[PDB]
Design a protein around this ligand. Sequence first.
Ligand SMILES: CCCCCCCCCCCCCCCC(=O)N[C@H](CSC[C@H](COC(=O)CCCCCCCCCCCCCCC)OC(=O)CCCCCCCCCCCCCCC)C(N)=O
Length: 183
Amino acid sequence: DAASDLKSRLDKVSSFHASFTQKVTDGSGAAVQEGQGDLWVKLPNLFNWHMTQPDESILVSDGKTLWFYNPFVEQATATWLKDATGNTPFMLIARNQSSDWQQYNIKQNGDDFVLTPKASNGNLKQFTINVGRDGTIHQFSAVEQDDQRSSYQLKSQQNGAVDAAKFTFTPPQGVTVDDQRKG
Ligand SMILES: CCCCCCCCCCCCCCCC(=O)N[C@H](CSC[C@H](COC(=O)CCCCCCCCCCCCCCC)OC(=O)CCCCCCCCCCCCCCC)C(N)=O
């Protein structure tokens, strides 16, 4: 079915670097903001997301901690990855339990998938992904409770090995770190 097809496309992703553009649109479909940058990914749970435009910001998952670094205000926040990802389909990738997939209704037309949480919890109503049978991810989006859509268009997906140094984060010199990890 759509779920087993999606997982079989996601099984074919190992690690990549991609460039992304970002289009945020309100419920009425008007433009809220535009942005671009780089994404490094390595299954099951590692990523480095670098917005350059319009405002620079870095998200690094080392697989346990999610680091948010905003170099403009020279601040970095550390959170548990499981806390930070809990209102997303993260776990559909980060492990492969039947449990996780049963929390979503999935509709498919070719490379286009829509995932709707059964019980919607958090500000996130809906997710879309466009991913080929080869495992190239062309697009994903998240719809917030107020119908604001964040759309990511990916390109230049290079499926080489990516250095594991991409998924370490050391706060730079004179960056104040707000460590929100309760031990
Ligand atoms: C295999 C390795 C692991 C998976 C790879 C991950 C790929 C990139 C991960 C991070 C990219 C998104 C970061 C943008 C959000 C942002 O800049 N928020 C900034 C500041 S932070 C505030 C923000 C509040 O939340 C928001 O409003 C934004 C929406 C949250 C992002 C959802 C988009 C992804 C869902 C689409 C795909 C669904 C289908 C998957 C099929 C299984 O909350 C957070 O703190 C960020 C937490 C999100 C980080 C994890 C993303 C979960 C992705 C789930 C898997 C998607 C698969 C894509 C590639 C395989 C802001 N201004 O709001």
